[PDB]
């Protein structure tokens, strides 16, 4: 039926690193001067042991991609770069995507392209993924490296080797497997190294209790687009009180009509102007909720900004574009930590679930949501991060990009059907449901036009 065919999830399956290995040429180990010395040492020894020359490439925090490109042209014929920028990485107080390793991963990639190095980059992360619910995502921002890395792989295959997660603070798994991983036997580019073995990222189809809105339900990005559709769905399900939040609030385009629409569907509705990146403003808002309709659910549909500019991706612009999504999510997480929420739903995207050319500015913030929901569930808190495909009707510019997705086999979902998928995901307490209409015959050939993948090996329709 319609709903069941929309449903997927990310799993981690046992897989082979590749056989043996044996490397030639020089490998650079990119790192910050302060951090990751132990892992760099194990990495060097593991690469040397397979037969490679290994040299350190000390990167400055938030460096310029042009002085770095100059440096890379002098070192001469490099066979690969191993990045530890995200290993042993400090967590100083800042917004989650201010992360230097994100900014420097992008500059490193760009400097490798500018300098015509001709060699792949491999990025190591530490507990950034969970192969199962018994593992905790350590820093949800490190998933942004995976989100954008999958886009970079689709835009410039030659420069992206892949992504490798290891347990935080351990080197034995990296030492054991690194050589076979970068020798690239089995076409794996999204790997988790664990004490018990090697795991590859995989898409999988996902086959009494009934969630209902109660008290006050909060929708960010609630005055338009997908959030407005969510508002309508909640009203039909009888939400006692809807609280819609956006930057403009009751001055947003269509807001007055939306409120009248929701009132006629049954829901008493408050609209508030609120900048959800401002923790204190959000705190004031939540404190104005009455005792008889306490906050019972959050639906965080604040979208990523797009100014319509096509510069080179920078960590700085990504952090700004996605702050409502990212900082809003973390603010709401911190401020509802002690409420008895029935649902805390983060609106993520296919941009992080598998990525696409042009979506590099969107995947990092949605990847962060994916990790924040898993972290919350590890910590005993309710959370759902829905990776949406495209929606029909409300929102989304028509032109060459959205036509391109449909051409590539991602079909817009009727709002009614997507919300039914969300209902089922909530009733089953899924942490990271993927909800998307894919025509696999078309999609796979578009997705692998320039680069093979194993990400879809477990989907029957894919073979």
């Amino acid at each position: 039926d319609e709903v069941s065919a929309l449903r997927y999830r990310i799993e981690w399956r046992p897989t082979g690193a590749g056989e043996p290995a044996r490397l030639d040429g020089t490998w650079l180990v990119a790192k910050y001067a302060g951090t990751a010395d132990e892992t760099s040492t194990a990495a060097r020894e593991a690469l040397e042991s397979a037969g490679a020359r290994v040299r350190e490439l000390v990167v400055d925090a938030r460096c310029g991609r042009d002085e770095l490109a100059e440096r890379l042209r002098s070192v001469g014929e490099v066979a690969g770069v191993l990045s530890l920028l995200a290993v042993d990485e400090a967590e100083p107080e800042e917004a989650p995507l201010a992360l230097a390793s994100l900014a420097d991963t992008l500059s490193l990639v760009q400097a490798m392209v500018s300098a015509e190095l001709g060699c792949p980059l491999w990025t190591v992360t530490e507990s950034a993924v969970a192969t199962g619910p018994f593992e905790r995502v350590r820093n949800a921002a490190h998933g942004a490296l995976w989100g954008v890395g999958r886009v970079i792989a689709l835009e410039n295959p030659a420069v992206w080797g892949g992504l490798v997660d290891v347990p935080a603070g351990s080197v034995a798994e990296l030492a054991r497997h690194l050589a076979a991983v970068v020798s690239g036997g089995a076409g794996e580019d999204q790997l988790a190294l664990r004490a018990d073995g090697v795991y590859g990222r995989r898409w999988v189809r996902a086959a009494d209790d009934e969630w209902k809105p109660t008290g006050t339900v909060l929708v960010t990005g609630g005055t338009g687009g997908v959030g407005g559709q969510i508002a309508r769905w909640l009203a039909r399900r009888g939400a006692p009180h809807l609280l819609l939040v956006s930057r403009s609030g009751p001055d947003a385009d269509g807001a007055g009509e939306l409120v009248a629409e929701l009132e006629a569907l049954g829901a008493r509705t408050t609209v508030a102007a609120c900048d959800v990146t401002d923790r204190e403003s959000v705190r004031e808002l939540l404190g104005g909720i009455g005792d008889d309709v306490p906050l019972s659910a959050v639906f965080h549909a604040a979208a990523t900004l797009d100014d319509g500019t096509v510069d080179t991706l920078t960590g700085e612009r990504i952090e700004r574009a996605s702050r409502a999504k990212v900082l809003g999510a973390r603010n709401l997480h911190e401020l509802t930590r002690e409420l008895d929420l029935t649902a805390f739903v983060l609106f993520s995207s296919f941009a992080s679930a598998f990525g696409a050319p042009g979506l590099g500015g969107y995947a990092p913030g949605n990847a962060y949501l994916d990790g924040l929901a898993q972290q919350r569930r590890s910590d005993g808190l309710p959370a759902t991060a829905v990776a949406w495909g495209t929606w029909a009707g409300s929102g989304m510019a028509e032109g060459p990009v959205a036509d391109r997705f449909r051409r590539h086999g991602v079909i817009e979902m009727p709002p009614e059907t997507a919300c039914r998928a969300l209902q089922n995901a909530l009733d089953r307490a899924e942490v990271c449901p993927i909800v998307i209409d894919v025509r696999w015959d078309r999609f796979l050939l578009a997705y692998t036009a320039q680069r093979p993948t194993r990400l879809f090996d477990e989907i029957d329709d894919a073979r």
């Epitope: 006050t216 006692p240 009180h241 609280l243 008493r268 509705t269 408050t270 508030a272 705190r283 939540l286 404190g287 104005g288 909720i289 009455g290 005792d291 008889d292 309709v293 306490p294 911190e334 401020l335 930590r337 002690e338 409420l339 008895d340």
Partner: antibody
Framework: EVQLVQSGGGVVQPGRSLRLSCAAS????????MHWVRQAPGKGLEWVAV????????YYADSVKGRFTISRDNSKNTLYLQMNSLRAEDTAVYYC?????????????????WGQGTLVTVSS | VLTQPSSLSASPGASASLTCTLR?????????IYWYQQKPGSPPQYLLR?????????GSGVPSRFSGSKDASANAGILLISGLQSEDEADYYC?????????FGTGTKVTVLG
């Protein structure tokens, strides 16, 4: 200044009815939920009922549910408590009390300002 | 539903901790506790409310030596009167929403010793 001027106390026979009123001034009456609270002499505070700023929501304590009706007249800046089937247990000072000003289209909060009270005595 | 000690005494200047304990089987964490002071022959006066460090508010005009918090161990809300003065002798009531009604605690009388 905020004022809640209460009327309508006195003696009432067991089983009969009594209507309390509270005339509000010094604030925009229709922007505030309104509570009734009672206190039997020498005893503790007992919440009775609340009505939302626009009158569309009402809640009552179990001990009065089905006997009392709370209501308001936003064109007369007046709050009412209609009390029926009164017993000796209902003898108390009855306080009008104002919630803080309404922020959202729905929701009530506990009082931030109280009236002086009126004694209702249920007696033969 | 809401249990308070009938009496509490402390000498001037001390820090009096008034407790408002919820029934077991119900977590104090999510409840917004309102506090009222009532002096002889006067209507109650609103002091403050506390749900958590995220969600709390001081009543208009109420001196800041009155503060709120919670003791999760004791499943109880706390009203703290720092710098207890003789003026603070009074009955103190906590109040919170539960089910479809507001409910008051049983009340605590505060005597200033000495």
């Amino acid at each position: 200044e905020v004022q809640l001027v209460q009327s309508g106390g006195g003696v009432v026979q067991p089983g009969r009815s009594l209507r309390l009123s509270c005339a509000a001034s010094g604030f925009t009456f229709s922007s505030y939920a309104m509570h009734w609270v009672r206190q039997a002499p020498g005893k503790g505070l007992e919440w009775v009922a609340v009505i939302s700023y626009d009158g569309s929501n009402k809640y009552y304590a179990d001990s009065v549910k089905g006997r009392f009706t709370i209501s308001r007249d936003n064109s007369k800046n007046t709050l009412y408590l209609q009390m029926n089937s009164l017993r000796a247990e209902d003898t108390a000072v009855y306080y009008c009390a104002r919630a803080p000003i309404q922020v959202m289209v729905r929701g009530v909060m506990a009082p931030d300002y109280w009236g002086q009270g009126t004694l209702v005595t249920v007696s033969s | 539903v809401l249990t308070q000690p009938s009496s509490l005494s402390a000498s001037p200047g001390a820090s009096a901790s008034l407790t408002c304990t919820l029934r077991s089987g119900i977590n104090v964490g999510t409840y917004r506790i309102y506090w009222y002071q009532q002096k002889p022959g006067s209507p109650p006066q609103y002091l403050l409310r506390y749900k958590s460090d995220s969600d709390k508010q001081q009543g208009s005009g109420v001196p800041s030596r009155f503060s709120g918090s919670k003791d999760a161990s004791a499943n109880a809300g706390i009203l703290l009167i720092s710098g207890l003065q003789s003026e603070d002798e009074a009955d103190y009531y906590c109040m919170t929403w539960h089910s479809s009604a507001y409910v008051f605690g049983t009340g605590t009388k505060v005597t200033v010793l000495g």
